Write a protein that binds this ligand. Structure first.
Ligand code: K
Ligand code: K
Ligand code: ZN
Lengths: 5, 363
């Protein structure tokens, strides 16, 4: 999981 | 004549997305200000039924999305697991907004299937990160996937080309196991940069091995090199895969002036990519996507609507509702930033050569 934002 | 997916109600719905407020209205109003709607066939979008959404998405996910949407419950314990949170808040009405967009992209695809047009446009679509059971990256429903599945009723092979700054992971993953849909994404790939996937070594799985193409690009790329890369890959893809229809995602978060400040493109460079795809003369479904400088996104998609129409537009932004957003210059052209291109010719050559080798397998 990553942040965009 | 191109189909333009539009209604006042649709645009108003799309205006309420949390991370791009008013963008849909700005885009439509600029296109209207250039009188381009008079050269297109306007088609009201149908809302996607639960069944149409469930051809990709799980009922559990859709049921949870519809639940939190009723009142905008942004504190539901299950939301984390369904991808709702900072990037994808549970705003009141979001299920309706996402069914509307899904529905718009399906409608566009149906126009294509029916021979109504060769080009159908949904500038409010392209929400390419959503997974079957997870919102991701400002995307709640994968309308691109839904549009591709709809086209698959009539067209034997679909090419998806994704020119958004970010890797089109949701669409790639949806089709990673099939040879009937080829996905091609050009994007920034640097550890820490969303969503963290899509290296040149990612080519799909099983029967879909080699039917995913990923083009990892570094910060600062400009029109000329980007087009060289895009044309080189698309030339090979087109010979190898022989698409019968195209879905094209044109996120404007690559354009100079974007707060994300990564690529350094202008609408003219993206338009050359678009032009190359349009001369194939295949059924082509046009989507938007990212774009966080709202005025520049409208400048980009207006210019691109122009190239779809074969018109050159006045450089002067016409007076309209959002005229003041276009200062201090009030022109359609966008000037690239004065910062380094971090893409080394050799690395680009290795990438293209690797892709060429992968495509030799596509029979
Ligand atoms: K992309
Ligand atoms: K594939
Ligand atoms: Zn993006």
């Amino acid at each position: 999981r990553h942040k965009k934002x | 004549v191109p189909v333009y997916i539009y209604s006042p109600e649709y645009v108003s719905m799309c205006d309420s997305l949390a991370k791009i407020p008013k963008r849909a209205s700005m885009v439509h109003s600029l296109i209207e200000a250039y009188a381009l709607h008079k050269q297109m066939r306007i088609v009201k979008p149908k809302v996607a039924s639960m069944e149409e959404m469930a051809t990709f998405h799980t009922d559990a996910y859709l049921q949870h999305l519809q639940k939190v949407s009723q009142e905008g419950d942004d504190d539901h314990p299950d939301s984390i697991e369904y991808g709702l949170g900072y990037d994808c808040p549970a705003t009141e009405g979001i299920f309706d907004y996402a069914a509307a967009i899904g529905g718009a992209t399906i409608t566009a695809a149906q126009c294509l299937i029916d021979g109504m047009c060769k080009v159908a446009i949904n500038w409010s679509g392209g929400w390419h990160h959503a997974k079957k059971d997870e919102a991701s990256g400002f995307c709640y429903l994968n309308d691109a996937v839904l549009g591709i599945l709809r086209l698959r009723r009539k067209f034997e092979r679909i090419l998806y080309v994704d020119l958004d700054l970010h890797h089109g992971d949701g669409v790639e993953d949806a089709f990673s196991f099939t040879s009937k849909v080829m996905t091609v994404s050009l994007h920034k790939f640097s550890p820490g940069f969303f969503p963290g996937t899509g290296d040149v070594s990612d080519v799909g799985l099983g029967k879909g091995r080699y039917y995913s193409v990923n083009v990892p690009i570094q910060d600062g790329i400009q029109d000329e090199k980007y087009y060289q890369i895009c044309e080189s890959v698309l030339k090979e893809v087109y010979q190898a895969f022989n698409p019968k229809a195209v879905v094209l995602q044109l996120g404007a978060d690559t354009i100079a002036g974007d707060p994300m400040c990564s690529f350094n493109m202008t609408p003219v460079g993206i338009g050359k990519c678009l032009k190359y795809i349009l001369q194939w003369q295949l059924a082509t479904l046009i989507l938007g996507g990212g774009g966080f400088n709202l005025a520049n996104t409208a400048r980009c998609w207006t210019y691109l609507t122009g190239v779809i129409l074969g018109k050159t537009l006045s450089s002067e932004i016409p007076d309209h509702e959002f005229f003041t957003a276009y200062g201090p210059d009030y022109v359609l052209e966008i000037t690239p930033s004065c910062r380094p291109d971090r893409n080394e010719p050799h690395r680009i050559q290795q990438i293209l050569n690797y892709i060429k080798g992968n495509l030799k397998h596509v029979v």
